[PDB]
Amino acid sequence: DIIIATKNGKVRGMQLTVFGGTVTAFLGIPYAQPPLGRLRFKKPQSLTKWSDIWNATKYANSCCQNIDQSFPGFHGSEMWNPNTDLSEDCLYLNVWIPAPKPKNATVLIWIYGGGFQTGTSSLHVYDGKFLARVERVIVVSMNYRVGALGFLALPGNPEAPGNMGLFDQQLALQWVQKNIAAFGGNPKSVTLFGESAGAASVSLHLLSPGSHSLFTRAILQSGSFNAPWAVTSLYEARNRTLNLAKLTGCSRENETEIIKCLRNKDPQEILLNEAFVVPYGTPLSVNFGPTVDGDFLTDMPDILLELGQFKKTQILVGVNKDEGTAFLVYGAPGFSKDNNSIITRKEFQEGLKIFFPGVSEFGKESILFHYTDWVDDQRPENYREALGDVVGDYNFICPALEFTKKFSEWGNNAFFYYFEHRSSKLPWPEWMGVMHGYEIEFVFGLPLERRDQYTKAEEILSRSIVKRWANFAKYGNPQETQNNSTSWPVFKSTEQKYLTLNTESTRIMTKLRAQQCRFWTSFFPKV
Ligand SMILES: *[C@@H]1O[C@H](CO)[C@@H](O)[C@H](O)[C@H]1NC(C)=O
Ligand SMILES: *[C@@H]1O[C@H](CO)[C@@H](O)[C@H](O)[C@H]1NC(C)=O
Ligand SMILES: *P(=O)(O)Oc1ccccc1C
Ligand SMILES: [Cl-]
């Protein structure tokens, strides 16, 4: 039997055999009072002590959320869908520790993406047993509230102050601080890592004074707070909270009464109205996400970044070669996962309307002008490739690069990667390339399991990535020192060196998407 005593009480785990070894999993440990009843939309309350033991032997409830129903039965989309019961009672976390119990282990804390609207820690691609086994780090991941239940904002008013889901994450980092030493973890060596909204979450913890002392280093996969989908303004969070109230018939005059009304609704009624709090949406709509609450976030984060107001430490940042492709089949005319999606100039233009609904005629045209000046000729996939690049560059790549330059300008070592490998098992079609979210299985070490139909070259690549991530967490330096590897250089501004990740040749390059990103971060914010 394997029992650990934590501040709030005893917890029992279970033994897992991985790679001829053993890993101890503590799945579903509670870290806050369930935010039910009068607690909905509030910050998370600390947990009530318990006698007896807590059986942490299965993944807990996932947080209430709408599910992707565009491709029922298709693994490509359903692998991201929640794999545990949905419930408002969902504030739990997981711990994987190597066996035997480590002495002073570096800790990796995972934060999932999901556009702040979806996600759960219990996904197969976030299984931390491989990392614990192979690198002897301890892996932690938590569930946190998403959508309106987690980001509904009536700013000021503590009944629904905004950013609750970010505070869920923060209370969990706190739990690691007070508890991880009992699991053989080193609270002084904690690395946050996350992807998409997870990565943008990590970036926000870098700015939040309440998070400063709760971690050491940070890894941001395909995401940062300066991404255009990442932070809702005070003015439009307001319109959204109100619109949600009208739709749900909770429009009151006393703001606190509106919240009280919203508290006596079935989550389904709130989930089903979330999508219409906006006049026109995009496949990348974040209807309820982070705001400037004056608490977790004390000012507009672009200002804090620009002015050096963040945790001074090392960061590891990167993106995938075809970030934008994933989103083209959730709306763009002429696009399908089931054919090669050769679209026309008119389908491209219509495609911008989908992705940039609120921008001017001139704005959509400026994008067209920048991305359609090509050569030879008359290449049928021109418009197809270009639209994917538009969405990728604007939503992910350029803000990640920009974040990194700005962060590095204040003295800290930063490391940038460009993930170029399309998985051998990718269920999506070839034209969609190296998709958003498909580096994760490599980071978490799935290809190490050689019964899982990955090629050997993928096993090797994953092993190197796992080693780089682990060395970054342990030592702030994402090198692989033992197997004649390419050194990964710091990303300085001006020089802007980055490292390519692929199965064949690993290369140092400079100035990723220079021309494109010049268009986005300099010209485009003016339109
Ligand atoms: C673990 O490591 C830290 C250094 O980061 C040290 O301060 C702490 O005392 C160590 N605790 C032990 C002995 O496990
Ligand atoms: C609104 O109602 C709440 C709950 O009864 C009360 O606490 C608050 O003081 C009221 N505020 C206003 C502006 O009437
Ligand atoms: P992530 O996979 O969470 O991608 C989304 C989805 C919806 C909205 C925004 C974003 C970044
Ligand atoms: Cl509080």
Coordinates of C-alpha atoms and ligand atoms in Angstrom, one line a residue:
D1 CA 0.0 0.0 0.0
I2 CA 1.2 3.5 -0.9
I3 CA -0.2 6.3 1.3
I4 CA 0.9 9.9 1.5
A5 CA 0.0 12.4 4.2
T6 CA -0.9 15.9 2.9
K7 CA -1.8 19.0 4.8
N8 CA -5.5 18.3 4.3
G9 CA -5.3 14.6 4.9
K10 CA -4.2 11.1 3.8
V11 CA -4.3 10.1 0.1
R12 CA -3.8 6.6 -1.5
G13 CA -2.6 6.1 -5.0
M14 CA -1.9 3.1 -7.2
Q15 CA 1.2 1.4 -8.8
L16 CA 1.6 1.5 -12.6
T17 CA 4.1 -0.6 -14.5
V18 CA 5.8 1.5 -17.2
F19 CA 8.8 0.3 -19.3
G20 CA 9.8 -2.5 -16.9
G21 CA 9.6 -0.1 -14.0
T22 CA 7.0 1.4 -11.7
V23 CA 5.3 4.8 -11.4
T24 CA 3.0 5.9 -8.6
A25 CA -0.2 7.7 -9.7
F26 CA -2.3 9.8 -7.5
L27 CA -5.3 10.6 -9.8
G28 CA -8.0 13.0 -8.7
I29 CA -6.8 14.8 -5.6
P30 CA -9.2 17.6 -4.6
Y31 CA -7.6 21.0 -4.2
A32 CA -10.6 23.3 -3.3
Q33 CA -14.2 23.2 -2.1
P34 CA -16.3 22.3 -5.1
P35 CA -17.6 25.6 -6.5
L36 CA -21.3 24.7 -6.3
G37 CA -24.4 26.5 -5.2
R38 CA -23.5 30.0 -3.9
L39 CA -19.9 29.3 -4.9
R40 CA -20.5 29.3 -8.7
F41 CA -18.6 32.2 -10.5
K42 CA -16.6 32.9 -7.3
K43 CA -12.9 32.4 -6.7
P44 CA -12.0 29.0 -5.3
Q45 CA -12.3 28.5 -1.6
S46 CA -9.6 26.5 0.3
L47 CA -10.2 22.9 1.2
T48 CA -11.8 21.6 4.4
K49 CA -9.6 19.1 6.3
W50 CA -10.6 15.4 6.2
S51 CA -10.1 12.4 8.3
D52 CA -9.9 8.9 6.8
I53 CA -8.1 8.4 3.5
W54 CA -8.9 9.8 0.0
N55 CA -8.7 7.2 -2.7
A56 CA -6.9 8.9 -5.6
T57 CA -7.2 6.0 -8.0
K58 CA -9.3 7.2 -10.9
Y59 CA -9.4 10.5 -12.8
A60 CA -11.9 13.0 -11.4
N61 CA -14.9 14.7 -13.0
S62 CA -14.0 17.1 -15.9
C63 CA -15.4 20.7 -15.7
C64 CA -18.7 21.5 -17.4
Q65 CA -18.1 22.3 -21.1
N66 CA -19.5 22.1 -24.6
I67 CA -18.2 19.3 -26.7
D68 CA -16.9 19.3 -30.3
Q69 CA -19.7 17.6 -32.3
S70 CA -18.4 18.3 -35.8
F71 CA -16.8 14.9 -36.4
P72 CA -18.6 12.3 -34.3
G73 CA -16.7 9.0 -34.3
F74 CA -13.5 10.5 -35.7
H75 CA -10.5 10.1 -33.4
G76 CA -8.9 13.3 -34.7
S77 CA -11.5 15.4 -32.9
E78 CA -12.8 13.1 -30.2
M79 CA -9.3 12.6 -28.7
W80 CA -9.7 16.2 -27.4
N81 CA -13.2 15.6 -25.9
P82 CA -13.5 15.0 -22.1
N83 CA -13.0 11.4 -21.1
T84 CA -14.6 11.7 -17.6
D85 CA -18.1 12.8 -16.4
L86 CA -18.7 16.5 -16.6
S87 CA -19.6 18.2 -13.4
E88 CA -19.3 21.6 -11.6
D89 CA -17.6 19.6 -8.9
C90 CA -14.3 19.4 -10.9
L91 CA -11.5 21.1 -9.0
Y92 CA -9.0 18.2 -8.7
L93 CA -5.5 17.4 -9.7
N94 CA -3.1 14.5 -10.4
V95 CA 0.4 13.6 -9.3
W96 CA 2.8 11.1 -10.9
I97 CA 5.9 10.3 -8.9
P98 CA 8.7 7.9 -9.9
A99 CA 9.2 4.7 -8.0
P100 CA 10.9 4.5 -5.8
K101 CA 9.9 7.8 -4.2
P102 CA 12.4 10.5 -5.2
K103 CA 14.2 12.6 -2.7
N104 CA 14.1 16.2 -4.1
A105 CA 12.5 15.9 -7.5
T106 CA 11.9 18.7 -10.0
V107 CA 8.2 19.2 -10.6
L108 CA 6.4 19.7 -13.9
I109 CA 2.9 21.2 -13.8
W110 CA 0.7 20.8 -16.9
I111 CA -2.0 23.2 -17.9
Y112 CA -4.2 22.1 -20.8
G113 CA -5.6 24.2 -23.7
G114 CA -9.2 24.3 -24.9
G115 CA -9.7 28.0 -25.8
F116 CA -10.6 28.6 -22.2
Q117 CA -13.9 27.0 -23.1
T118 CA -12.9 23.3 -23.1
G119 CA -10.2 20.8 -21.8
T120 CA -9.4 18.3 -19.1
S121 CA -6.3 17.0 -17.4
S122 CA -7.4 13.4 -17.8
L123 CA -6.7 13.1 -21.6
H124 CA -4.5 10.3 -22.9
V125 CA -2.1 12.8 -24.4
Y126 CA -1.5 14.4 -20.9
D127 CA -0.6 11.2 -19.2
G128 CA 2.4 12.0 -17.0
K129 CA 3.5 8.4 -16.2
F130 CA 6.2 8.4 -19.0
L131 CA 7.9 11.6 -17.9
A132 CA 8.0 10.3 -14.3
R133 CA 9.4 7.0 -15.3
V134 CA 12.0 8.1 -17.8
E135 CA 13.3 11.4 -16.4
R136 CA 12.4 10.9 -12.7
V137 CA 10.6 14.3 -12.5
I138 CA 7.2 14.6 -10.8
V139 CA 4.3 15.5 -13.1
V140 CA 1.3 17.5 -11.8
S141 CA -1.8 18.5 -13.8
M142 CA -5.1 20.1 -12.6
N143 CA -8.6 20.7 -13.8
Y144 CA -9.7 24.3 -13.8
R145 CA -13.1 25.9 -14.7
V146 CA -13.6 27.0 -18.3
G147 CA -16.2 28.9 -20.2
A148 CA -18.6 31.3 -18.4
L149 CA -18.5 29.1 -15.2
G150 CA -14.8 30.0 -15.1
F151 CA -14.4 33.4 -16.7
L152 CA -17.8 35.2 -16.4
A153 CA -16.8 38.8 -15.5
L154 CA -18.6 41.5 -13.7
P155 CA -15.4 43.4 -12.9
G156 CA -15.0 44.6 -9.3
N157 CA -18.0 42.7 -8.1
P158 CA -16.6 39.7 -6.2
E159 CA -19.7 37.6 -6.9
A160 CA -18.3 37.1 -10.4
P161 CA -15.0 39.0 -10.5
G162 CA -13.4 37.3 -13.6
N163 CA -10.5 35.0 -14.0
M164 CA -11.8 32.3 -11.6
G165 CA -10.3 29.5 -13.8
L166 CA -6.9 31.2 -13.6
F167 CA -7.3 31.3 -9.8
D168 CA -8.2 27.6 -9.9
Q169 CA -4.8 27.0 -11.5
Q170 CA -3.2 29.3 -8.9
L171 CA -4.7 27.5 -6.0
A172 CA -3.3 24.3 -7.5
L173 CA 0.3 25.7 -7.9
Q174 CA -0.2 26.6 -4.2
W175 CA -1.2 23.0 -3.4
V176 CA 2.1 21.9 -4.9
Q177 CA 4.0 24.4 -2.8
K178 CA 2.5 23.1 0.5
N179 CA 2.3 19.4 -0.4
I180 CA 4.7 18.2 -3.0
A181 CA 7.6 17.7 -0.6
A182 CA 5.5 14.9 1.0
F183 CA 5.5 13.2 -2.4
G184 CA 9.3 13.7 -2.7
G185 CA 9.0 16.9 -4.8
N186 CA 11.1 20.0 -4.6
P187 CA 8.7 23.1 -4.3
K188 CA 11.7 25.2 -5.2
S189 CA 12.0 23.5 -8.6
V190 CA 8.6 23.8 -10.3
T191 CA 8.2 24.3 -14.0
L192 CA 4.8 25.3 -15.4
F193 CA 4.1 24.0 -18.9
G194 CA 1.0 24.2 -21.1
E195 CA -0.3 24.4 -24.6
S196 CA -2.6 26.9 -26.5
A197 CA -4.8 28.5 -23.8
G198 CA -2.7 26.5 -21.4
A199 CA 0.4 28.2 -22.7
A200 CA -1.4 31.6 -22.6
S201 CA -2.3 30.7 -19.0
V202 CA 1.4 30.0 -18.2
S203 CA 2.3 33.4 -19.7
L204 CA -0.3 35.1 -17.5
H205 CA 1.2 33.4 -14.4
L206 CA 4.4 35.1 -15.4
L207 CA 2.6 38.5 -15.0
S208 CA 0.5 37.7 -12.0
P209 CA 2.2 38.8 -8.7
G210 CA 0.2 36.1 -6.8
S211 CA 1.9 33.5 -9.0
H212 CA 5.5 34.8 -8.8
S213 CA 6.5 32.8 -5.7
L214 CA 4.6 29.6 -6.9
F215 CA 7.0 28.5 -9.6
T216 CA 10.5 28.8 -11.0
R217 CA 10.4 28.4 -14.8
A218 CA 8.0 28.3 -17.7
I219 CA 7.4 26.5 -21.0
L220 CA 4.8 27.9 -23.5
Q221 CA 3.6 25.5 -26.3
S222 CA 1.8 27.3 -29.1
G223 CA 0.3 30.1 -27.0
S224 CA 0.8 33.4 -25.2
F225 CA -1.4 36.0 -23.6
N226 CA -0.6 38.5 -26.4
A227 CA -2.4 36.2 -28.8
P228 CA -5.6 38.0 -30.1
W229 CA -7.9 35.3 -28.7
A230 CA -6.2 35.3 -25.3
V231 CA -7.5 38.4 -23.3
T232 CA -11.0 39.8 -23.3
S233 CA -11.4 43.6 -22.7
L234 CA -13.4 45.0 -19.8
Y235 CA -15.9 46.5 -22.2
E236 CA -16.7 43.3 -24.1
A237 CA -16.6 41.0 -21.0
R238 CA -19.3 43.3 -19.7
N239 CA -21.5 43.1 -22.9
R240 CA -21.1 39.3 -22.7
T241 CA -22.1 38.9 -19.1
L242 CA -25.1 41.0 -19.8
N243 CA -26.0 39.2 -23.0
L244 CA -25.7 35.9 -21.2
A245 CA -28.2 37.4 -18.7
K246 CA -30.8 38.4 -21.4
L247 CA -30.6 35.0 -23.1
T248 CA -31.0 33.2 -19.9
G249 CA -33.7 35.6 -18.7
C250 CA -31.6 36.8 -15.8
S251 CA -31.5 40.5 -16.7
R252 CA -31.7 42.4 -13.5
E253 CA -30.8 45.9 -12.4
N254 CA -28.8 45.1 -9.3
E255 CA -25.7 43.4 -10.8
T256 CA -25.4 41.1 -7.8
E257 CA -29.0 40.0 -8.4
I258 CA -28.0 39.1 -12.0
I259 CA -25.4 36.8 -10.6
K260 CA -27.8 35.3 -8.0
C261 CA -30.2 34.6 -10.9
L262 CA -27.4 33.0 -12.9
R263 CA -26.6 30.8 -9.9
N264 CA -30.1 29.1 -10.0
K265 CA -29.6 27.8 -13.6
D266 CA -28.7 24.4 -14.8
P267 CA -25.2 24.4 -16.2
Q268 CA -26.8 23.2 -19.5
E269 CA -28.8 26.4 -19.8
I270 CA -25.6 28.4 -19.3
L271 CA -23.6 26.2 -21.6
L272 CA -26.1 26.4 -24.4
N273 CA -26.3 30.2 -24.3
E274 CA -22.5 30.9 -24.0
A275 CA -22.1 30.8 -27.8
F276 CA -24.6 33.7 -28.5
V277 CA -23.2 36.3 -26.2
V278 CA -21.4 37.6 -29.3
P279 CA -22.9 38.9 -32.5
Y280 CA -20.6 36.9 -34.8
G281 CA -18.2 34.2 -33.9
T282 CA -15.2 32.5 -35.4
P283 CA -13.8 28.9 -34.9
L284 CA -11.3 30.7 -32.6
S285 CA -13.9 32.6 -30.6
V286 CA -13.1 32.9 -26.9
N287 CA -16.4 34.1 -25.5
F288 CA -15.4 33.8 -21.8
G289 CA -11.7 34.1 -21.2
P290 CA -9.1 36.1 -19.1
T291 CA -9.8 39.7 -18.3
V292 CA -8.1 42.5 -16.5
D293 CA -9.7 41.8 -13.1
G294 CA -7.5 44.2 -11.1
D295 CA -6.5 41.1 -9.0
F296 CA -4.8 38.3 -10.9
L297 CA -4.1 40.8 -13.7
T298 CA -3.6 44.4 -12.5
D299 CA -3.3 46.1 -15.9
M300 CA -3.5 45.3 -19.6
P301 CA -0.9 42.6 -20.1
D302 CA 0.6 44.1 -23.3
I303 CA 1.7 47.1 -21.1
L304 CA 3.1 44.9 -18.3
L305 CA 5.1 42.9 -20.9
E306 CA 6.3 46.0 -22.8
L307 CA 7.4 47.6 -19.5
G308 CA 9.2 44.6 -18.0
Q309 CA 6.7 43.8 -15.3
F310 CA 6.9 40.1 -14.9
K311 CA 8.7 37.2 -13.2
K312 CA 12.4 37.2 -14.2
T313 CA 13.3 33.7 -15.1
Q314 CA 13.9 31.3 -18.1
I315 CA 11.3 30.6 -20.7
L316 CA 11.0 27.9 -23.3
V317 CA 8.7 28.9 -26.1
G318 CA 7.7 27.3 -29.5
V319 CA 5.1 26.6 -32.2
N320 CA 4.3 24.0 -34.8
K321 CA 4.8 24.5 -38.5
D322 CA 1.0 24.4 -39.4
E323 CA -0.8 25.9 -36.4
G324 CA -3.7 27.3 -38.4
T325 CA -4.9 24.2 -40.4
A326 CA -7.0 22.7 -37.6
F327 CA -9.4 25.6 -37.6
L328 CA -10.0 25.8 -41.3
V329 CA -12.4 22.8 -41.2
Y330 CA -14.6 24.3 -38.5
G331 CA -16.1 27.0 -40.8
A332 CA -14.1 27.9 -43.9
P333 CA -16.0 27.2 -47.2
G334 CA -14.4 24.7 -49.5
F335 CA -12.5 23.1 -46.6
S336 CA -12.9 19.5 -45.5
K337 CA -10.9 16.9 -43.7
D338 CA -12.2 14.4 -46.3
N339 CA -10.7 16.0 -49.5
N340 CA -7.6 18.0 -50.5
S341 CA -9.4 21.3 -50.0
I342 CA -8.2 23.0 -53.1
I343 CA -10.0 26.3 -52.8
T344 CA -10.3 29.3 -55.1
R345 CA -9.6 33.0 -54.7
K346 CA -13.2 33.6 -53.9
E347 CA -13.2 30.9 -51.3
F348 CA -10.1 32.4 -49.7
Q349 CA -11.8 35.9 -49.6
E350 CA -14.9 34.3 -48.1
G351 CA -12.6 32.5 -45.7
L352 CA -11.3 35.8 -44.3
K353 CA -14.9 37.0 -43.6
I354 CA -15.2 33.8 -41.4
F355 CA -11.9 34.4 -39.6
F356 CA -12.0 38.2 -39.5
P357 CA -15.7 39.2 -39.3
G358 CA -15.3 42.5 -37.5
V359 CA -12.5 43.9 -39.5
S360 CA -12.8 46.4 -42.4
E361 CA -13.0 45.8 -46.1
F362 CA -9.5 47.3 -46.3
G363 CA -8.2 45.1 -43.4
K364 CA -9.3 41.9 -45.1
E365 CA -7.8 43.1 -48.3
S366 CA -4.4 44.0 -46.7
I367 CA -4.2 40.4 -45.5
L368 CA -5.0 39.2 -49.0
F369 CA -2.4 41.4 -50.5
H370 CA 0.4 40.2 -48.1
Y371 CA -0.4 36.5 -48.4
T372 CA -1.2 36.1 -52.1
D373 CA 1.8 37.6 -53.9
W374 CA 3.3 34.4 -55.2
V375 CA 5.3 32.5 -57.8
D376 CA 4.2 29.6 -60.0
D377 CA 1.5 30.2 -60.6
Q378 CA -1.3 28.8 -60.7
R379 CA -0.3 26.4 -58.0
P380 CA -3.7 24.9 -57.0
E381 CA -3.0 24.8 -53.3
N382 CA -1.8 28.4 -53.1
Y383 CA -5.0 29.7 -51.5
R384 CA -5.4 26.6 -49.3
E385 CA -1.8 27.0 -47.9
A386 CA -2.2 30.7 -47.6
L387 CA -5.4 30.7 -45.5
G388 CA -3.9 28.2 -43.1
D389 CA -0.8 30.4 -42.8
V390 CA -2.9 33.5 -42.2
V391 CA -4.7 31.9 -39.3
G392 CA -1.5 30.3 -38.0
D393 CA 0.7 33.4 -38.2
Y394 CA -2.0 35.8 -36.7
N395 CA -3.2 33.6 -33.9
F396 CA -0.2 31.7 -32.7
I397 CA 3.2 32.1 -34.3
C398 CA 3.6 35.9 -34.4
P399 CA 2.3 36.5 -30.9
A400 CA 4.7 33.7 -29.5
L401 CA 7.7 35.2 -31.3
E402 CA 6.7 38.7 -30.2
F403 CA 6.2 37.6 -26.6
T404 CA 9.7 35.9 -26.6
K405 CA 11.5 39.0 -28.0
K406 CA 9.9 41.2 -25.4
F407 CA 10.5 38.9 -22.5
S408 CA 14.1 38.3 -23.5
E409 CA 14.7 42.1 -23.8
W410 CA 14.8 42.2 -20.0
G411 CA 17.9 40.0 -19.5
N412 CA 16.5 36.5 -19.2
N413 CA 17.5 33.4 -21.2
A414 CA 14.8 32.3 -23.6
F415 CA 14.7 29.4 -25.9
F416 CA 12.6 29.1 -29.1
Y417 CA 11.6 26.0 -31.1
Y418 CA 9.9 25.3 -34.3
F419 CA 8.2 21.8 -34.3
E420 CA 8.2 20.4 -37.8
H421 CA 7.2 16.8 -37.4
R422 CA 3.8 15.4 -38.6
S423 CA 3.0 12.3 -36.5
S424 CA 3.0 9.0 -38.4
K425 CA -0.4 8.3 -36.8
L426 CA -2.1 11.7 -37.5
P427 CA -5.8 10.9 -38.2
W428 CA -6.2 14.3 -40.0
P429 CA -5.3 14.4 -43.7
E430 CA -1.9 15.2 -45.1
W431 CA -2.7 18.8 -46.3
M432 CA -3.3 19.9 -42.8
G433 CA 0.4 19.2 -42.0
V434 CA 2.1 19.6 -38.6
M435 CA -1.1 20.5 -36.7
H436 CA -1.8 22.7 -33.7
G437 CA -1.6 20.4 -30.6
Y438 CA 0.3 17.4 -32.1
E439 CA 3.6 18.0 -30.4
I440 CA 2.1 17.2 -27.1
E441 CA 2.2 13.4 -27.5
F442 CA 5.9 13.8 -28.1
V443 CA 6.5 16.0 -25.1
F444 CA 4.6 13.6 -22.9
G445 CA 6.6 10.7 -24.3
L446 CA 3.9 8.6 -26.0
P447 CA 6.2 7.4 -28.8
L448 CA 8.5 5.8 -26.2
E449 CA 5.9 3.1 -25.9
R450 CA 7.0 0.9 -28.8
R451 CA 3.8 -1.1 -29.0
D452 CA 1.9 2.0 -30.0
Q453 CA 2.6 2.0 -33.7
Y454 CA 5.1 4.9 -33.8
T455 CA 8.2 4.7 -36.0
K456 CA 11.6 4.3 -34.3
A457 CA 12.6 7.8 -35.6
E458 CA 9.6 9.2 -33.6
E459 CA 10.7 7.2 -30.5
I460 CA 14.1 8.9 -30.8
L461 CA 12.7 12.4 -31.4
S462 CA 10.4 12.1 -28.4
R463 CA 13.2 10.8 -26.2
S464 CA 15.3 13.9 -27.1
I465 CA 12.3 16.3 -26.6
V466 CA 11.5 14.7 -23.2
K467 CA 15.2 15.1 -22.3
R468 CA 15.3 18.7 -23.4
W469 CA 12.1 19.6 -21.5
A470 CA 13.3 17.9 -18.4
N471 CA 16.7 19.5 -18.5
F472 CA 15.0 22.8 -19.0
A473 CA 12.9 22.2 -15.9
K474 CA 15.8 20.9 -13.8
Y475 CA 18.5 23.3 -14.9
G476 CA 17.0 26.1 -17.0
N477 CA 18.8 24.8 -20.1
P478 CA 17.0 22.7 -22.7
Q479 CA 20.1 20.8 -24.0
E480 CA 20.6 17.1 -24.7
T481 CA 24.3 16.8 -23.6
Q482 CA 25.0 13.1 -24.2
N483 CA 24.3 12.1 -27.7
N484 CA 26.2 14.5 -30.0
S485 CA 23.2 16.8 -30.2
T486 CA 22.8 20.3 -31.7
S487 CA 23.2 22.9 -29.0
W488 CA 20.0 24.9 -28.5
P489 CA 21.1 28.7 -28.4
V490 CA 19.4 31.4 -26.3
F491 CA 16.9 33.5 -28.3
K492 CA 18.3 37.0 -28.1
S493 CA 16.3 39.8 -29.7
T494 CA 18.0 41.1 -32.9
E495 CA 19.6 37.7 -33.6
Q496 CA 16.5 35.6 -32.9
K497 CA 18.0 32.1 -33.2
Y498 CA 15.6 29.2 -32.9
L499 CA 15.9 25.4 -33.0
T500 CA 14.0 23.1 -35.4
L501 CA 12.6 19.9 -34.1
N502 CA 12.2 17.0 -36.5
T503 CA 13.1 13.3 -37.0
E504 CA 15.9 13.8 -39.5
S505 CA 18.1 16.9 -39.0
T506 CA 17.9 19.4 -36.2
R507 CA 18.9 22.9 -37.3
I508 CA 19.6 26.4 -35.9
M509 CA 17.8 29.0 -37.9
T510 CA 17.1 32.7 -37.4
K511 CA 14.1 35.1 -37.6
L512 CA 11.1 32.8 -37.9
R513 CA 8.3 34.3 -40.2
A514 CA 10.1 37.7 -40.3
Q515 CA 8.1 39.2 -43.2
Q516 CA 4.7 37.7 -42.1
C517 CA 5.2 38.8 -38.4
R518 CA 6.2 42.3 -39.5
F519 CA 2.7 42.5 -41.2
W520 CA 0.8 41.2 -38.2
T521 CA 2.4 42.8 -35.1
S522 CA 3.2 46.2 -36.7
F523 CA 0.8 47.0 -39.6
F524 CA -2.3 45.0 -38.6
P525 CA -3.2 46.3 -35.1
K526 CA -3.9 49.6 -36.7
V527 CA -6.9 48.5 -38.8
Ligands
LIG1 C1 16.0 20.2 -1.9 O1 16.6 21.1 -2.8 C2 16.6 22.5 -2.4 C3 17.4 23.2 -3.5 O2 16.7 23.7 -4.5 C4 17.1 22.7 -1.0 O3 17.0 24.1 -0.7 C5 16.3 21.9 0.0 O4 16.8 22.1 1.3 C6 16.4 20.4 -0.4 N1 15.6 19.6 0.5 C7 15.9 18.3 0.7 C8 17.1 18.0 1.6 O5 15.3 17.4 0.1
LIG2 C1 -28.1 44.9 -4.6 O1 -28.6 43.7 -4.0 C2 -27.6 43.1 -3.2 C3 -28.2 41.8 -2.6 O2 -29.3 41.9 -1.9 C4 -27.2 44.0 -2.1 O3 -26.3 43.4 -1.2 C5 -26.6 45.3 -2.7 O4 -26.2 46.2 -1.6 C6 -27.6 45.9 -3.7 N1 -26.9 47.0 -4.4 C7 -27.6 48.0 -5.0 C8 -26.8 48.9 -5.9 O5 -28.8 48.2 -4.9
LIG3 P1 -6.9 25.6 -28.2 O1 -6.8 24.1 -28.7 O2 -7.7 25.7 -27.0 O3 -7.5 26.4 -29.4 C1 -8.6 27.3 -29.4 C2 -9.9 26.9 -29.5 C3 -10.9 27.8 -29.4 C4 -10.6 29.2 -29.3 C5 -9.3 29.6 -29.2 C6 -8.3 28.6 -29.2 C7 -6.8 29.0 -29.1
CL4 CL -10.3 36.2 -2.3

